[PDB]
Design a protein around this ligand. Structure first.
Ligand SMILES: Nc1nc2c(ncn2[C@@H]2O[C@H](COP(=O)(O)OP(=O)(O)OP(=O)(O)O)[C@@H](O)[C@H]2O)c(=O)[nH]1
Lengths: 112, 109
């Protein structure tokens, strides 16, 4: 039931984890690089998910803020995206936010 | 003043008001024709566009995420790609729709 969904609409959870929904973390251009082993294993059941999720864009923001392209290639047709989301450094939590995000960025380098 | 990434554009609060002018620069959005820019989530093809926007889980799962410090602040960066389903009956309509919007600003009067 979880795996029936198009990839961009999947919701990772302990039962259907980040690796299962979105592939092994890793270094390549269109492979995901985000998550330490606890997030990878728990998905949205991760205890600090909401403090990560506060940075994800709404659908309107996703198409409003991003640089969208379309590439047709031997594998299919791909909607490419790029953008950046500013952290609020007025937020007393800003320090914590950074540390939490950096915990998960490229964390895969540190384990098998 | 919701966080920018949480805003939702509508006729009352439009793509330009919410996310700024469409343009060539790396901090600007390039997506939307004049009608989508005016209507936001009221746009008559919104559902067919939104079908490609990632869940929170998917945004963080699929993307290459980074963090950069610049004079304007600290930025969570993201890049990646969302494969269209070839075998969907509506694939061809999706292509047309996407083409209508990507860098549409280049032809605005
Ligand atoms: N970046 C990106 N990669 C994708 C996308 N769709 C498929 N891929 C990659 O191509 C592979 C092809 O697998 P699919 O059958 O499309 O999806 P799956 O989740 O592996 O398979 P099921 O869960 O059994 O449906 C995936 O494992 C991904 O790594 C996408 O929308 N974006």
């Amino acid at each position: 039931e979880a795996s029936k969904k198009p990839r961009q609409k999947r919701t990772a959870t302990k039962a259907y984890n980040v690796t299962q929904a979105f592939g092994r973390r890793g270094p390549e251009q269109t492979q995901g690089n985000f998550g330490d082993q606890e997030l990878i294993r728990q998905g949205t059941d991760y205890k600090h998910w909401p403090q990560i999720a506060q940075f994800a864009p709404s659908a309107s923001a996703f198409f409003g803020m991003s640089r969208i392209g379309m590439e047709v290639t031997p594998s299919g047709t791909w909607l490419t995206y790029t953008g950046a989301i500013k952290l609020d450094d007025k937020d007393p939590n800003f320090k914590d936010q950074v540390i939490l995000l950096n915990k998960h960025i490229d964390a895969y380098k540190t384990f098998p």
